[model samples]
Target: MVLSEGEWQLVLHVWAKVEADVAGHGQDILIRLFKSHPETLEKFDRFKHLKTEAEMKASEDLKKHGVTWLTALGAILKKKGHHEAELKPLAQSHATKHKIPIKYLEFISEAIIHVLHSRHPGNFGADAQGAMNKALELFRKDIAAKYKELGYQG
Candidate 1:
């Protein structure tokens, strides 16, 4: 999905934080998510192996790709201004293809916050929450725009 300059800044900030602490804080989040929601494992083919080291490596790889994608998306949005108008159909395709429930996204977000807080107690104070709120707002707004652009009622 496309991200505005502001959104990109948030993305970079969050990515940097994750990159710096993934081995500790990030790892905890992954473990918590997998343990709490084992069903989510069905979403990835790599999880079938049941190997901790393999899963950790795969998670890191995925995170790297996600960081790259977010960076590129930010660049695109900065130049184009509002790529959400064009991203809706793709969102719908993903939702449909994965049969993902709408609520799952919120769950994922909450789970992430839970993990982050558990690992880094003092890092996310009021200021950090404010920043996250802005980022999440943009994320939801973009998703809605994308779905609308694709002619989906969602």
Candidate 2:
């Protein structure tokens, strides 16, 4: 909702490039996130035992969850409005039940940006990157707002 029409287009344009390989791209993003912050692995019991980069890369659980996450993200990006409603349940579960730190959202956003830009250098100009950053920040902000509304202390 924060994005102007043009800005939204920029985000979607780049997304279309990798949408077909959402599972693969999602795996790459998660790998990047884990490599950058190994401590974050504690959050995922499903694949936390994965030791080496190779093991992690070949992980079916990781790939499945990666596909799940990027599918959520795809819906978020395509929805284009009313993000708060879409994110409320997710924020509630994350804050109350899952107890995920909000900072992880920021890190995931960073990983997405890094992977997308690095994989397709020509597609992401400064403007496109900026659009992507703002789009993900909107996701974080909506979840944070829901967390506050739910009276989640964390």
- Provide the TM-score for each candidate, comma-separated: 0.55, 0.94
Q: What tens-digit string does per-residue lDDT give for candidate 2 at 1-154?
A: 4789888898999999989798999899999999998988888877879998999998988999999889888888887756656687788878988788888888889999999999877889999999899888888877787788888755
Candidate lDDT values, in order: 0.54, 0.86
The sequence of per-residue lDDT tens digits that candidate 1 reaches over residues 1-154 is: 3445654565456545655644454445545556677776466564544556456556755455445434443443343345554455447764556554445555555666676555544666555655555555556566655655555544
Evaluated with TM-score, which candidate comes out highest?
2
Name the runs in model 1 displaced over 4 angstroms.
1-15, 21-28, 48-93, 148-154
Query: What lDDT does candidate 1 reach at residue 31?
Result: 53
Q: Which candidate wins on lDDT? A: 2
| lDDT score, candidate 2 | 0.86
